[PDB]
Write a protein that binds this ligand. Structure first.
Ligand SMILES: *P(=O)(OC(C)C)OC(C)C
Length: 249
């Protein structure tokens, strides 16, 4: 969050707060707007989960590089906490039903549809007011449970055009979600770009088939590989590469 507090020559920031409908989760949303002028068709915009951790890792070198191409509006959707994650809240908000199948691991799970309604009908309309946004260039990113949320949203949403799903293979219901992803009807998901991002290191077998089937179904689906990265470097790589990609790299 602190780069928002400090300011950047490349971008200006504001922060807004929202509550879940059940009243028990409390969101802190940072909007970073480029200080360079938007193209006439508007800024691309990337909505990013785990927003507190994204803001802690955002730095001027990335903002400078984004500004070499078409810098996006960045919406970091975080929590009212002084830690980089709200582990309880994200396990609820980011996960679909399937994540708790045949287990007693479940911090409760299964809040993805209510969090998507909050995001698409409450947070996004508010933070886009007053900005020239290129709606065809609206993207969503998340890692780990956040990567499951992105797959869940690629299946159900009409709001975003680009979906960057990082490390979803870490989730228990990864295969169940891939099974739904490759079951979609031909052509209906053609306007929803899907970018699967994996590092960590099979998983790759699953992804190549996934890409093959989705292509056959008319989907622009791609794989970003960050070989042998640990969790921290992969969190960083995938969010920064998603920003760079949506800026036009
Ligand atoms: P992710 O939300 O985070 C890893 C970096 C530990 O993990 C879930 C899938 C267990």
């Amino acid at each position: 969050p602190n780069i928002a507090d400090k300011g950047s020559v490349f971008y200006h920031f504001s922060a807004t707060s929202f509550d879940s409908v059940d009243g028990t989760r409390h969101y802190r949303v940072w909007t970073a707007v480029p200080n360079t002028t938007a193209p006439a068709s508007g800024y691309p915009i990337l909505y990013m989960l785990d927003g507190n951790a994204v803001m802690d890792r955002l730095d001027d070198e990335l903002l400078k590089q984004l500004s070499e191409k078409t810098p996006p509006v960045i919406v970091a959707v975080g929590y009212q906490t002084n830690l980089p994650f709200d582990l309880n809240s994200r396990a609820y908000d980011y996960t679909p039903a399937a994540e708790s199948r045949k287990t007693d691991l479940h911090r409760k799970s299964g809040g993805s549809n209510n969090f998507r309604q909050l995001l698409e009908t409450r947070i996004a309309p508010k933070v886009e007011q007053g900005l020239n946004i290129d709606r065809q260039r609206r993207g969503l990113w998340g890692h780990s449970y956040g990567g499951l949320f992105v797959l869940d949203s690629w299946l159900s949403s009409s709001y975003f055009r680009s979906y960057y799903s990082a490390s979803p293979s870490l989730g228990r219901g990864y295969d169940a979600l891939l099974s739904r992803v490759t079951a979609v009807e031909p052509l209906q998901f053609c306007t929803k770009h899907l970018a699967i991002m994996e590092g960590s290191a099979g998983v790759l077998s699953k992804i190549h088939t996934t890409l093959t089937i989705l292509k056959d179904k008319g989907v622009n689906a791609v794989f970003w590989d960050f070989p042998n990265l640990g969790h921290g470097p992969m969190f960083n790589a995938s969010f920064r590469q998603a920003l760079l990609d949506i800026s036009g790299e």
